Design an enzyme around this catalytic site. Structure first.
Site, mmCIF file in Angstrom:
data_model
loop_
_atom_site.group_PDB
_atom_site.id
_atom_site.type_symbol
_atom_site.label_atom_id
_atom_site.label_comp_id
_atom_site.label_asym_id
_atom_site.label_seq_id
_atom_site.Cartn_x
_atom_site.Cartn_y
_atom_site.Cartn_z
ATOM 1 C CG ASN A 1 -9.128 33.634 -7.141
ATOM 2 O OD1 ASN A 1 -9.577 33.206 -5.994
ATOM 3 N ND2 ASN A 1 -7.958 33.677 -7.876
ATOM 4 C CD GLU B 1 -9.370 39.805 -15.685
ATOM 5 O OE1 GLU B 1 -8.284 39.115 -15.156
ATOM 6 O OE2 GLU B 1 -9.778 40.655 -14.692
ATOM 7 C CG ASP C 1 -6.840 34.497 -11.384
ATOM 8 O OD1 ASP C 1 -7.817 34.614 -10.604
ATOM 9 O OD2 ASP C 1 -5.838 34.829 -11.528
ATOM 10 C CG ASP D 1 -4.114 33.793 -3.460
ATOM 11 O OD1 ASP D 1 -3.492 33.372 -4.607
ATOM 12 O OD2 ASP D 1 -5.365 33.765 -3.137
ATOM 13 C CB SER E 1 -6.348 31.234 -5.502
ATOM 14 O OG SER E 1 -5.633 32.493 -6.127
ATOM 15 C CG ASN F 1 -3.404 34.295 -8.616
ATOM 16 O OD1 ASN F 1 -3.053 35.181 -9.504
ATOM 17 N ND2 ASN F 1 -4.572 33.449 -8.624
#
Length: 130
Positions: free
Chosen positions: A60, A35, A53, A49, A51, A46
């Site tokens: 998220n 990750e 991370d 959408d 959002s 992102n």
């Protein structure tokens, strides 16, 4: 902070992550590696959408932490997303524990499925003394 492999492994063990909700240490190690590269300041927006991370575990903003700018989001960990960018991973570990208490467990992270599930993950903790 960019952790060294064994340094992280020993930190995560002290923080009680070995076998948490049935998840072995090595699995947590494989997840952090894919990750964020063991980077606590990593962030990934992102655009699809809206959002973001955050952190070593790439948690998220839609469900886990509040960043104020994600539409229709919740903050299940009760933390500011800024907390997940600290060099001290205490809050990030407590939130990751929260994420895995839900039905999907560690499968909530798609990268874990792609890169860690059904693999020999022993390499992540080999020689670290954990």
């Amino acid at each position: 902070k960019v952790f060294e492999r064994c340094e992280l492994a020993r930190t995560l063990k002290r923080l009680g992550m070995d076998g948490y909700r049935g998840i072995s240490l090595a699995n947590w190690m494989c997840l952090a590696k894919w990750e964020s590269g063991y980077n606590t300041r990593a962030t990934n927006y992102n655009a699809g959408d809206r959002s973001t991370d955050y952190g070593i575990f790439q948690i998220n903003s839609r469900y886990w932490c509040n960043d104020g700018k994600t539409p229709g989001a919740v903050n299940a960990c009760h933390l500011s997303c800024s907390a997940l960018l600290d060099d001290n991973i205490a809050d990030a570990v407590a939130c990751a524990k929260r994420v895995v208490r839900d039905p999907q467990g560690i499968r909530a992270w798609v990268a874990w499925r792609n890169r860690c599930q059904n693999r020999d993950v022993r390499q992540y903790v080999q020689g670290c003394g954990v």
